[PDB]
């Protein structure tokens with residue numbers, strides 16, 4: 001195991017994914033302990049007001065995020081070359097606290113490895129406490145055999161399309177391309193954009209210690 005407490009500390013697991021503390025919204029300590037297949041949040045101090053940015057997005061990813069590219073990743077890859085993008089996750093939830101468990105999937109018109117990607121897909125596997133996505137609800141969508149409440153808006157940097165589960169999902173395997181297709185169909189990307197990373201983790205606003213990604217996988221096949 002490897003403990004990371006630096007706000008933007010990272011480590012690689014299984015020689016394939018990056019675990020990031022990614023403490024981008026908080027002045028209080030946070031630590032994650034990386035395992036060979038995921039990570040656990042071992043300290044997550046402080047609170048963030050629940051109508052604003054979360055404290056952080058501790059997560060594991062395949063791809064490139066602010067110059068940090070996971071070992072051997074084939075991302076960025078143009079979407080029209082992707083046959084499938086399977087991913088799977090197992091989450092450990094905490095009772096109480098205020099957080100989501102979410103995927104972040106980033107798309108851009110360029111083969112982007114640094115900076116803000118133009119579109120963000122956020123898939124909320126769980127929601128606890130009085131938090132909601134960026135923007136406005138739109139309606140429901142059926143993606144991957146599951147129903148989602150779709151939200152759309154912008155954060156000032158990028159577009160955000162969110163798919164929110166009706167109740168907690170502790171584990172799933174799915175095709176990221178199913179969500180990319182739904183995003184393209186709403187005009188928030190095009191078939192000749194690039195997939196630049198597939199990330200999974202948590203956005204905590206209050207507490208968060210004990211949250212875990214037990215396992216994660218992501219492949220992008222061309």
Ligand SMILES: OC[C@H]1O[C@@H](O[C@H]2[C@H](O)[C@@H](O)[C@H](O[C@H]3[C@H](O)[C@@H](F)[C@H](O)O[C@@H]3CO)O[C@@H]2CO)[C@H](O)[C@@H](O)[C@@H]1O
Pocket residue numbers: 008020022024054056057066104120122134155157160203
């Ligand atoms: O990780 C190093 C870089 O962190 C940058 O902060 C990013 C952060 O990495 C992203 O994960 C985060 O994404 C937000 C997104 O903007 C929201 F729309 C969404 O609801 O939630 C995700 C996850 O919380 O965005 C922040 C801030 O832009 C930081 O700015 C860089 O300087 C740093 O190099």
